[PDB]
């Protein structure tokens, strides 16, 4: 797997690949690893598929549960804490081979200026969490390649659209160097999924735009 997320002026974007494996065997080609967990946050998980899907589902339910109970949504710090507690809680199964690591991307409606309200938070198997202040982060078997790719491409992020381009190219580099992350599939028409979050909330990116960007990247690498 490879999940990426980066801040752009005005919001944040998260992108995830589509591959599923059992050893060397490709078991999935259309997985959706990036979930809109509430109006202003998306969660992308790497690891054991059942644990990741369980995490996304239960975390979304938990946030909305609090929201309906208290009449107001959690602070972003609270969201962080709940996710971290979930991971820490799964540590034991994680050591038995049921490991799942999330990456959180959100928009803090309570930040001072809305151009930097984007938040990217990473986690580890022990429940540790870190608000990334360098603009971007990735998690999964291909996160090193994706991060070292964004390290070079991040200066090109000037809005949401360029953000999505850089996210898709980071995923492309990840799939270039990691057999467990899936690249764009032009034969079947399958591409990474992406969410973009701004002050108007979280929205799924339409497949056609991702495909456009992918083809541009490919036709650029090839000439």
């Amino acid at each position: 797997t490879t999940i990426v997320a980066l801040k752009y002026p005005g919001g944040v974007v998260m992108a995830g690949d589509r591959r599923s494996t059992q050893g060397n065997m490709i078991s999935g080609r259309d997985v959706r690893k990036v979930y809109i967990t509430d109006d202003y946050t998306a969660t992308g998980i790497a690891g054991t598929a059942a644990v990741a899907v369980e995490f996304a589902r239960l975390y979304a339910v938990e946030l909305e549960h609090y929201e309906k109970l208290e009449g107001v949504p959690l602070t972003f710090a609270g969201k962080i804490n709940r996710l971290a507690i979930m991971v820490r809680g799964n540590l034991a199964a994680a050591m038995q081979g049921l490991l799942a690591l999330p990456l959180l991307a959100g928009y803090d409606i309570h930040a001072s200026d809305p151009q930097s309200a984007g938040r990217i938070v990473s986690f580890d198997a022990a429940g540790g969490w870190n608000i990334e202040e360098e603009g971007y982060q990735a998690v999964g078997s291909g996160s090193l390649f994706a991060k070292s790719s964004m390290k070079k491409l991040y200066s090109q992020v000037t809005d949401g659209d360029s953000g999505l381009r850089v996210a898709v190219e980071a995923l492309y580099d990840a799939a270039d160097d990691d057999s467990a992350t899936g690249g764009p599939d032009l034969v079947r028409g399958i591409f990474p999924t992406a969410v973009i979050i701004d002050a108007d909330g979280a929205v799924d990116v339409p497949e056609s735009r991702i495909a456009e960007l992918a083809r541009a990247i490919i036709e650029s690498r090839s000439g």
Partner: protein, 215 residues
């Protein structure tokens, strides 16, 4: 035995009669909740699930407990199965069971009256559903409107006159506030919300302040 049940029934009936009124009625856009409420932050109307909403009259803390229990139920069932398996009928049913057990076994019955409403899912054609649950767990199916709290009979009559199917939002709100008036007057004393069948996912939305005044 029979006198104890008469005493509990009377304590509940008086409790509910002594409280502000709430109205819920089906209109073209879904369901409309209109409740007398002089507070700014304590709420009598609530969301329970994607398309399912909640309104209550009586002693606040008790129907707030029941409200929280209903949300717990809904979220739990949606998790154990799938979101779309959560239905207004389900929740009204479980409120019937719960209020039965409270009325017969609690140290003091709950002085509350409950309404559970459900509108269709986005793009579906489904008539709204309105359920009412009383303090003893009695449950009623209503096709047009529900009146709860205080002196309900005058309000119910005014609505029996002024109500028409598939009214607009404005017509429905004004009709509702008329009915509420014929039983005891502006934004600062009203709580208004709707189950909006035209919303894509979460239908519950409040109407407050400037938006409410303009109706």
């Amino acid at each position: 035995m029979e006198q104890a049940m008469r005493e509990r029934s009377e304590l509940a009936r008086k409790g509910i009669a002594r409280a502000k009124s709430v109205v819920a009625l089906a209109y073209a856009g879904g369901v409309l909740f209109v409740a007398e409420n002089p507070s700014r932050s304590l709420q009598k109307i609530s969301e329970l699930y994607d398309r399912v909403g909640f309104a209550a009259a009586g002693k606040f803390n008790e129907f707030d407990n029941l409200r929280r229990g209903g949300i717990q139920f809904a979220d739990t069932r949606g998790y154990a199965y799938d979101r779309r398996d959560v239905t207004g009928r389900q929740l009204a049913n479980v409120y019937a069971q719960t209020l039965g057990t409270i009325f017969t076994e609690q140290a003091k019955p709950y002085e509350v009256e409950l309404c559970v409403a459900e509108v269709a899912h986005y793009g579906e054609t489904k008539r709204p559903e309105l359920y009412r649950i009383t303090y003893d767990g009695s449950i009623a199916d209503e096709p047009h409107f529900v009146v709860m709290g205080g002196t309900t009979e005058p309000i119910a009559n005014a609505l029996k006159e002024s109500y028409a199917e598939n009214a607009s939002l404005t017509d429905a709100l004004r009709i509702a506030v008329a009915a509420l008036r014929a039983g005891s007057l502006g934004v600062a004393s009203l709580e208004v919300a709707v189950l909006d069948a035209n919303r894509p996912r979460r239908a519950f939305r409040r109407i407050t302040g400037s938006a409410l005044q303009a109706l």
